[PDB]
Design a binder for this molecule. Structure first.
Ligand SMILES: Cc1ncsc1-c1ccc([C@H](C)NC(=O)[C@@H]2C[C@@H](O)CN2C(=O)[C@@H](c2cc(O[C@@H](C)CN3CC[C@@H](N4CCN5c6cc(-c7ccccc7O)nnc6NC[C@H]5C4)C3)no2)C(C)C)cc1
Ligand SMILES: Cc1ncsc1-c1ccc([C@H](C)NC(=O)[C@@H]2C[C@@H](O)CN2C(=O)[C@@H](c2cc(O[C@@H](C)CN3CC[C@@H](N4CCN5c6cc(-c7ccccc7O)nnc6NC[C@H]5C4)C3)no2)C(C)C)cc1
Ligand SMILES: Cc1ncsc1-c1ccc([C@H](C)NC(=O)[C@@H]2C[C@@H](O)CN2C(=O)[C@@H](c2cc(O[C@@H](C)CN3CC[C@@H](N4CCN5c6cc(-c7ccccc7O)nnc6NC[C@H]5C4)C3)no2)C(C)C)cc1
Lengths: 109, 149, 103, 92, 148, 87, 104, 148, 91, 92, 148, 99
């Protein structure tokens, strides 16, 4: 399960779009509250892509549906805070679409 | 240095709310106390703007450079945020003197080269030509602070 | 726009800037601040013509393009003695020595 | 207690005393220093102007020190110049 | 935890009601008990004398519906800088469509008739659960113990 | 993208996906660009969308928010629809 | 400010926004994106009269005060039969029940 | 399609107005909405503190007429190399004689009076079609879908 | 090469062909089968066609040219008739 | 504040303090321990030179941190040598 | 060092001479040897083909006096974004009054006559120290070893 | 000497002006080059006072005239404080070194 969970989370991070740019670069590490106090006043449950790798080693996620529930939570957290049509908004729309195709290849093939 | 921002290092979240009928030019006084133009607020708009505490601001009609008010006074200095609450800058028309208000309207209708065609006193002509100005007003505001001190 | 000025009376020369839009009166006030003599004891001339307190430096003839920092425009100054004003007198600056042979 | 402002063409305007005092020129004219004068006469101010000068007194008195929002005091082009003249004379 | 702090330092404030509703300013006292204060009509503003650290809260005087002040739920005036007044901008929140519907139904139907509406039983209970300063204060505490 | 909500009487409502997701029950159903509501008429589902428009636009707006109006005639059926949707 | 609109050809109803400033053509392009029919096959009507591809939404009549998110302005849509661009058809929404005596 | 890119990497820029006109710098936001910024008087230059990938546009503050920056329509600062500032040179384009004439007529005649000019109907429409940032942005999008 | 443009009142304007070709409508009249050096404008007066040439001078000079271009001035008195002339020509 | 520079022939030049401080030599003479006194006397610098030295202060202060083009600071042949001397002495 | 690194990726640039002087553009080659290029007359501006990462320097073609490009000493074209040309704004620096005087004296007196001027020998040595690209390049390296 | 050098450097840091504000924090820690590349392009020998407390422990300064030479260097590297600090260091060394 840990080998499968790493294949899905690493594919979403390593994923580059059709101009060669990596999308996860901004999502890899959440900013500090001193930096951006608004994110932590609006976003209820802040989580990043390294806090998901942390919870894959600590075995907090019991199934591949619990790993998905918190990748949708940050991708939806990001979408809320940012402007619609923003660079970061539409990539959390793509990172949900690349996670839903990455889990569908590893978990059943 | 009299009327200037202070290097606080402590960020203050602020909400610029333009309740004037005019396009508003927010003007940040820098640490030396030199006016710095910032992006304009359309009438009836409000924005959250990242700032720092002790920073000193000032608002004006982006077009005419006419004087505005923020929280019923002339200068706005953000307080340190309490528990993340954003401080609020309410920008409004002042009650202009009838004269200054008339000047505003005449100035807005007549091209400056035609002020000479109006059958008015030369002193009034000079007043029309005098256009309101951040720097002149800053100089006045300092003398009003050395008169309180 | 900015205008760069030499306000000169006798052997005194004041270097200062002012706006085209600023007025002859405001300039007298700057002089008051330095030479400690009010605007009603001062007359300011552009060349030989007296300047009205109410006109803008612009209207008097001073422009940014003829009052540059390294070529300041000269405003002449006269003070009042009792019932009469002194003549506008600007004592000239020292002459330079004849150009040395190489140049 | 009210005050009577009389235009060139001889219209009478009855406005509150405090409203009128917003004009330095009027304050001067009102304030023989044993008791108060009700009338003041403007030889060179027509009605369509002095009417609007009052409307300003109404406006100024009402909206001075009012907290949330003040509206712009409108002046039609047709009246603008004569009002500016009157305004400067009155000191309002 | 949620209470005013006895301060001795005055803080002049401007209560600006930019909601369509009559606004009930609610001052939390030192013990932290809600104290109703005089209502602000819609589109009005008043300068009020308050103190530093004093905690306030605003609501629809009629319905006791929740309002917002400077995009948040509680207002605490900072120390005045140079005597200039602090500003409390009171506005509607974006109510859930449900809560908003309840508001309207509640305003049209007498509480004894909620039982006559051909709706789900759960909705009857929701209708009957009128909004309330104290219930909301309890919630706000748990939301501050969850941030600790 | 966009999403299609279909009323009992069979009207089609095309609204942005993110606008629709404001409804937990729709969020659940789309978790597919179509959803059919056999018990929600158009005059109701039309207004449910108008709320999505409103909520999306005015959430996190600092200066001023306008009251989301609901006419008496629609109030009850909307309350029903509202609760079913979780909007 | 933006303008909030409902375009309702026949049974269908599209909920979308646009700029106060923007063009009737840009709106046709958004419809193209959803209903997969180019701007030259659609004609857009405000009430009973067609709006030209070139006009600013402002000039057509749509402003903040008539096209609010909770009261979207209704723009009519006509789709093209190859022989003729079909006449403007809008399908009326379901009626609400008579106001119950409890709410009077 | 046409928007600034959130970067967090500062890029010092020099806005140099070498047009005879007052210049309105227009920053495209991340959402891609034009944002008016403080105007540059003719023959002036300022250091600006922008960010990498931020997209800008310049225009006649009065007429909203199109200008050029570095002989093109859009300016996007590169990351600074060795602390050296980027330079944005803002100038008049060579307007068509027609467009230039329109500019002058538009500047002399009130828009409600365009109707009174004894001219061809097409020109009436041309005078009415005032230049506009948004119209031009829409055009620039189709010019970028045509180059891909 | 120089082309001759002739105004209504009958002034002759000798301007370079390349300068003139800036007008799409003149390009058409010259590159067409015709029966050239001359083109006659029966409805364009001299004070206008003179300024139309001055634009050709301007356009040709300040194009394919980089750091600064100056405003092409048009006096109010000529503005309307020039706009007409300008439209009738390609620019 | 302002400061008074006095030439050999005895012309007085009143220039802003900050303008004068452009000269290390002057900075030293003023900042050297009322304290920071208004006057400084140059027994070896004539007026036609010290006048131009000020004009440079005006120029330097104004055009330092000007982002676009700066114009040439002109020096006539007749004055060039004496100015170079004065310049070196002043450290400006 | 001042490398002018081979890129093979072209970078269109606009050399704009906004100095009153004739400007000598100086390209540092790959070995880092200054290469004189064609001079720009005062108030002229031309599009030039350079490559990304190529390092340039500008000077008074006559006196070899130091100039500035975008308020700094070195210009390195960034990779062009969307084909937009980069801009190199070449200007006078604010020379010290001394250095400026030297410039004028040097321009009036033949170098063999510097010895005949009734000035101090130190000033004569300063006159003799003519400005020089190579000396300045050496200094710029020690200013980069000092940032290490 | 180390006790005397600490008394002088700590008095200049702890020194508050007549509004109660401490002047030294804007000299206690130098900024990073990433933050402000202009100071490290224009200033030759960057030194803070934490780098002066570092050189008081490492004994790089041999006399009280070598400690002063580098406090004048940073203060020469708030307009007035660059000077007020120089004026509070020149009165702090004059009290400790001779009393
Ligand atoms: C005088 C004069 N004259 C003529 S013009 C002019 C003038 C010139 C300048 C100004 C003023 C002073 N300057 C401006 O107006 C400039 C210019 C133009 O460029 C816009 N701008 C602005 O200031 C915008 C602006 C500021 C900003 O700063 C960020 C880069 C710094 N931020 C820290 C944090 C980072 N981001 C990091 C990910 N982060 C997010 C992360 C996540 C996330 C991450 C991990 C896991 C899950 C997650 O969800 N999600 N969302 C995020 N979004 C936020 C983002 C923040 C960037 N950038 O732009 C202002 C206007 C917006 C005035 C006049
Ligand atoms: C009008 C006016 N006014 C005022 S100024 C002015 C003006 C300005 C400019 C010009 C003129 C037209 N322009 C210039 O002078 C410009 C400007 C400045 O930038 C220098 N430059 C030049 O032109 C140099 C120049 C040209 C070049 O082009 C290469 C990048 C592209 N070349 C193909 C191939 C590549 N390299 C490929 C690996 N290759 C090697 C590979 C290997 C190797 C590889 C694998 C395994 C084993 C191997 O050994 N080994 N060695 C290699 N060496 C070569 C290398 C080439 C190069 N770059 O710079 C010119 C002058 C030198 C006019 C007016
Ligand atoms: C969309 C829209 N619409 C309408 S308005 C708007 C909008 C509004 C705002 C923004 C953007 C996001 N916000 C802003 O523009 C805000 C606003 C207003 O509050 C100012 N500000 C700014 O950004 C300034 C600003 C930044 C800053 O941060 C300092 C704390 C810190 N830095 C600066 C001062 C340096 N100091 C660093 C040590 N340094 C020295 C240190 C030493 C030294 C010597 C020896 C030993 C140790 C040492 O440390 N020596 N010398 C030094 N020199 C001085 C000092 C400088 C760091 N504060 O203000 C910016 C513009 C200036 C966007 C849109």
């Amino acid at each position: 399960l840990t080998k499968q969970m790493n294949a899905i989370i690493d594919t979403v991070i390593n994923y580059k779009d059709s101009s060669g740019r990596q999308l996860s670069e901004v999502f890899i590490q959440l900013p500090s509250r001193k930096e951006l106090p608004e994110y932590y006043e609006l976003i209820r449950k802040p989580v990043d892509f390294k806090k998901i790798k942390e919870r894959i080693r600590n075995h907090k996620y019991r199934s591949l549906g619990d790993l998905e529930k918190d990748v949708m939570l940050l991708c939806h957290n990001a979408q809320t805070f940012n402007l619609e049509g923003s660079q970061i908004y539409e990539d959390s729309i793509v990172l949900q679409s690349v996670f839903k195709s990455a889990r569908q290849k590893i978990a059943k093939e | 240095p009299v009327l200037r921002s202070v290097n606080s290092r402590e960020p203050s979240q602020v909400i610029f709310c333009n309740r004037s009928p005019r396009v508003v030019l927010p003007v940040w006084l820098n640490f030396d106390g030199e006016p710095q133009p910032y992006p304009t607020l359309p009438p009836g708009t409000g924005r959250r703007i990242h700032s720092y505490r002790g920073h000193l601001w000032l608002f004006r009609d982006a077009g005419t450079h006419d004087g505005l008010l923020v929280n019923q006074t002339e200068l706005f200095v953000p307080s340190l945020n309490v528990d993340g609450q954003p401080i609020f800058a309410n920008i409004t028309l002042p009650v202009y003197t009838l004269k200054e208000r008339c000047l505003q309207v005449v100035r807005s209708l007549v091209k400056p080269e035609n002020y000479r065609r109006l059958d008015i006193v030369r002193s009034l002509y000079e007043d029309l030509e005098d256009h309101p100005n951040v720097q002149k007003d800053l100089e006045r505001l300092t003398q009003e602070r050395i008169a309180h001190q | 726009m900015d205008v760069f000025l030499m306000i000169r009376r006798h052997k005194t020369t004041i270097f200062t800037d002012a706006k085209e839009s600023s007025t002859v009166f405001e300039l007298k006030r700057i002089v008051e601040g330095i030479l400690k003599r009010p605007p009603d004891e001062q007359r300011l001339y552009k060349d030989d013509q007296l300047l009205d307190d109410g006109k803008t430096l612009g209207e008097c003839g001073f422009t940014s393009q003829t009052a540059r920092p390294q070529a300041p425009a000269t405003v002449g100054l006269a003070f009042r003695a009792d019932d009469t004003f002194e003549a506008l007198c600007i004592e000239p600056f020292s002459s330079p020595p004849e150009l040395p042979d190489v140049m | 207690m009210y005050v009577k402002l009389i235009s060139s063409d001889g219209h009478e305007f009855i406005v509150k005393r405090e409203h009128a005092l917003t004009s330095g020129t009027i304050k001067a004219m009102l304030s023989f220093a044993e008791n108060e004068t009700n009338e003041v006469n403007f030889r060179e101010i027509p009605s369509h102007v002095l009417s609007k000068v009052c409307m300003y007194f109404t406006y100024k008195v009402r909206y001075t020190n009012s907290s949330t929002e003040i509206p712009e005091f409108p002046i039609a082009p047709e009246i603008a110049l004569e009002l500016l003249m009157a305004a400067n004379f009155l000191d309002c």
